[PDB]
Design a protein around this ligand. Structure first.
Ligand SMILES: O=c1ccn([C@@H]2O[C@H](COP(=O)(O)OP(=O)(O)O)[C@@H](O)[C@H]2O)c(=O)[nH]1
Length: 435
């Protein structure tokens, strides 16, 4: 079997597993006992299997909100139970042919290699960010990484844009705001040189210098965007109520709003975001997660409820593919960004941390498919700014420029994953290797 081990939370690794199954491989999703008991399995063509993070009954992340402590606990129990799993699978007649793993779990590679199982690292961040972390891991850049260092990489043809202070990945530019995440970002690459394969959820045409560098440096092969085949127009509709609302809207009219599944916004930040949205005048679909809703006042919720819909969950790819969708106000997490690209949807970028500031810079300055919100002197996003950016992308002099670039990259993204495409060829090479 092909074992797939994402960070326990994913869809891009599952999408790659669907393609492996197309090619006659047998994928298994590996997740925590907790997650397996408290969510539906993926279904065919996948098996599922479980490891433990120490909290099979309760959410260990809830239980352990300090990141270092959670990660140390996940390693302890995860490495032991992943070892047990590799043995029990072999004994059950289903020995792992390869472990595909998120290298935010670097212990997974140690365990597999000790069990004699091939390993395939699966990076789901852009090549531009991954390569920066790698240069630190390899002791070619010291901490903190600076704009000066980034400029060197741009001048050497490794990075395709010059990253300023607000564009360098904060986990290495300002390490220690986030010590555990700094360590985790860099340790992805520690030992990656002994993996059998290295894979990245991107496409060459998007990040050509960075992909090329990742390939020559780390053997990384692009396999993305790792999304459902339907969205990539590769021939080899839901009933969710938000969709019915979207159906009634005019073409390219609606702002989708999401800051993702992980970041938390305080009451002040939700106030500026929600007021900016109302103040724009645009219809909007604002996904505010169940676990964040308590911070949204009645007043702000009802403020413009004749134009805007607030929901706890929307099928985002289906939303992005909808004719009524005009732009996406997004934190520009990588999955969000690729889903916007594959649907040709212009972006208003409101990054927080991790890969988002870098992504945002590429969005506005190389890809040209949107704009990034400008924070004021104290680093606060103002409602006037939120509104200005929405209006810039939906009504500016440059509105067709953002749409054109989004469309352009949509087509390249599709070409990459279709038969003959740069990503398709890498996926096929992997499937053959492990067949
Ligand atoms: O209401 C939602 C919110 C999120 N997603 C999906 O969950 C992921 C969000 O990931 P991203 O890398 O952009 O940032 P994160 O959530 O990890 O910060 C993407 O696949 C989204 O399509 C969705 O379908 N509906």
């Amino acid at each position: 079997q092909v074992l797939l081990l994402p960070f326990p939370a994913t869809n891009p690794m599952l999408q790659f597993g669907r393609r492996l199954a197309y090619h006659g491989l047998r994928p298994t999703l590996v997740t925590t006992r907790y997650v397996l008991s408290t969510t539906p399995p993926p279904g065919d063509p996948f098996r599922v299997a479980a490891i433990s993070d120490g909290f099979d009954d309760a959410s260990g992340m809830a239980a352990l909100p300090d990141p270092g402590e959670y990660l140390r606990t996940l390693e302890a129990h995860g490495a032991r139970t992943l070892a047990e799993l590799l043995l029990s699978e072999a004994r059950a007649g289903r020995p792992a042919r390869v472990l595909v793993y998120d290298p935010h779990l670097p212990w997974a590679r140690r365990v597999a290699r000790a069990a004699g199982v091939a390993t395939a690292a699966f990076l789901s961040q852009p090549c531009a960010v991954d390569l920066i972390y790698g240069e630190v891991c390899a002791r070619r850049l010291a901490l903190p990484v600076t704009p000066t260092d980034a400029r060197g990489l741009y001048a050497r043809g490794v990075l395709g844009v010059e990253l300023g202070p607000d564009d360098v990945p904060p986990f290495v530019a300002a390490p220690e705001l986030t010590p555990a995440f700094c360590e985790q970002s860099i340790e992805q690459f520690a030992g990656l040189e002994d993996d059998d394969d290295v894979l990245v959820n991107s496409f060459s045409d998007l990040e050509p210098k960075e992909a090329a560098y990742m390939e020559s440096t780390w053997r990384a092969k692009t396999i993305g965007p790792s999304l459902p085949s339907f969205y990539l127009d590769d021939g080899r509709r839901s009933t969710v109520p938000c969709m019915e609302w979207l159906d009634k809207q005019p073409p390219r009219s609606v702002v989708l709003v999401s800051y993702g599944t992980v970041s938390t916004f305080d009451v002040a930040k939700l106030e500026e975001l929600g007021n900016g949205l109302c103040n724009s005048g645009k219809p909007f679909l604002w996904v505010v997660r169940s676990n964040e809703e308590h911070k949204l006042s009645v007043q702000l919720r009802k403020k413009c409820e004749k134009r805007g819909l607030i929901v706890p969950f929307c099928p985002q790819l289906e939303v992005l593919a909808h004719k009524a969708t005009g732009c996406f106000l997004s934190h520009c997490g990588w999955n969000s960004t690729l889903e916007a690209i594959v649907n040709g949807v212009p972006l208003v970028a409101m990054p927080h941390w991790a890969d988002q500031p870098t992504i945002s810079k590429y969005v506005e300055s190389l890809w040209g498919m949107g704009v990034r919100v400008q924070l004021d002197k104290s680093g606060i996003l103002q409602r006037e700014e939120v509104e200005r950016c929405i209006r810039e992308v939906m009504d500016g002099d440059r509105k067709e420029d953002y749409r054109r670039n989004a469309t352009r990259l949509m087509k390249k993204a599709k070409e990459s994953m279709q038969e003959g495409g740069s990503s398709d060829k890498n996926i096929a090479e992997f499937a053959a290797k492990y067949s």
